[PDB]
Amino acid sequence: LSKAKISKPAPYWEGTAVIDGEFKELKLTDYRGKYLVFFFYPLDFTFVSPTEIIAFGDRLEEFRSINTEVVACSVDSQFEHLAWINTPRRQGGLGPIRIPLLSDLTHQISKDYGVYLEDSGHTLRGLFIIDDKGILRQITLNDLPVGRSVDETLRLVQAFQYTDKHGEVCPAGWK
């Protein structure tokens, strides 16, 4: 039932995101021309701590140096996303965040990406790296509240771009 495959176009999505405290409509093809790291961030009963979106948002400029945008997606509506954003993180909210929080209210994004568990309504923490032509280059799945790694995500993004520019060569760094 998952539509996410390596080297095929990443499954299309569109929905309402919270960007800078306001509602914007977002489409996967908006990010055409740049790399997109797209990861799922459950706010449900498994939630434990704001750490991961804070970590990715604070370093988002590093991603933009390499022509990469970051967006998180969750199965809650834009309104509860804004409620979470307006809840201070001392009280168990996210506080201000600098990456778009996308809404999957219909659940079909989480299923297209094979990250949705239909028993609990819970989303596994998938992270996906999509290149500037919309091809899916990376799938990372686990259920860890935290987490993924901003360092290894950017390292993966740079590895993909190096493969795209130099495809028939071995860099000296390989042994």
Partner: protein
């Protein structure tokens, strides 16, 4: 209610309490917020089973606010609940279920009397090897001697069995694990808690002991920077040089440092983590669980200075260097 501790009231409140269960929390962590109500209710349940105002005290520390207090007690996670008896911090955290009745039964357990009474000379026949034993001899169970013994028992009842009797000339005696070594009878004042607890402390818990990767777990969660002698198990000489020397120089560090020795051949990769090979043993190092620090050439451990200043340079954070 739940006292919120800070740098000003921390010491007095914990010292005058006979039992204090303190909750080290951070509110950006959901497990902490989920704990707070259960903590409050458990506190009330115990407050009715008590107080005389000082029997049992539930307190809290916000480690976001006071990071000083947090690092003083080396809190690496949230929440952590710690038991302070008179302001000494018990080395075993509450790892139990988080529920009102689990916490309640826990406070009742630690407020219970660990010492087991006996009839004259009854089972002192056979206890031994197995565990350690210690038995106080009191003509009555209301005495300053017996309350001192009862404090020491409350702290130490996990590493030894404490018992009580009557009819012998007031004195407490120690029996080690076996019938080889005898008593070992305490000659000190039984009205002084510090010398008595130092004495029975001395028999119960060894100053250094063996790390093996099986109990590596238990000892890692003690939360202390290691100082290790890596030695081949045929080599007993380095190990008693090490025991003697940390007894001379570092004994004041008994509870801030775990002093351990490791079989050099099983811990090869811990020794691979540094420049040393299993035939470079004897080797002395601190493992902060962040990095490992070699002491240098072993024999320098014999000068009265070097080993004491070696650990104060971890406490002073001196040189890293290199790797």
């Amino acid at each position: 209610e739940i006292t919120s501790l800070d740098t000003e009231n921390i010491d007095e409140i914990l010292n005058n309490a006979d039992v204090a269960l303190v909750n080290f929390y951070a509110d950006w962590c959901r497990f902490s917020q989920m704990l707070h109500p259960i903590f409050e209710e458990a506190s009330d349940v115990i407050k009715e089973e008590f107080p005389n105002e000082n029997q049992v005290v539930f307190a809290r520390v916000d480690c976001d606010q006071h990071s000083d207090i947090a690092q003083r007690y080396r809190i690496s996670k949230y929440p952590t609940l710690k038991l302070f008896r008179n302001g000494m911090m018990m080395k075993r955290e509450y790892r139990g279920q988080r529920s009102v009745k689990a916490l309640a039964d826990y406070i009742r357990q630690q407020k219970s009397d660990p010492i087991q009474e006996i009839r004259d000379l009854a089972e002192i026949t056979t206890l031994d090897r197995s565990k350690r034993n210690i038995i106080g001899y009191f003509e009555q169970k209301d005495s300053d001697n017996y309350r001192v013994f009862e404090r020491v028992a409350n702290i130490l009842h996990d590493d030894c069995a404490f018992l009580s009797a009557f009819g012998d000339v007031d004195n407490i005696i120690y029996k080690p694990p076996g019938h080889s070594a005898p008593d070992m009878v305490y000659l000190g004042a039984m009205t002084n808690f510090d010398v008595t607890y130092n004495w029975i402390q001395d028999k119960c818990v060894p100053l250094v002991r063996e790390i093996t990767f099986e109990n590596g777990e238990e000892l890692t969660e003690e939360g202390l920077p290691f100082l290790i002698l890596f030695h081949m198990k045929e080599d007993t000489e380095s190990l008693e040089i090490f025991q003697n020397e940390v007894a001379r120089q570092l004994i004041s560090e008994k509870g801030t440092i775990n002093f351990l020795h490791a079989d050099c051949d099983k811990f090869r990769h811990p020794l691979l983590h540094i420049q040393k090979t299993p035939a470079d043993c004897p080797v002395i190092a601190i493992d902060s669980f962040r990095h490992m620090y070699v002491f240098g050439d072993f024999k320098d451990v014999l000068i009265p200075g070097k080993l004491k200043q070696f650990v104060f340079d971890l406490h002073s954070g001196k040189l890293h260097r290199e790797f």
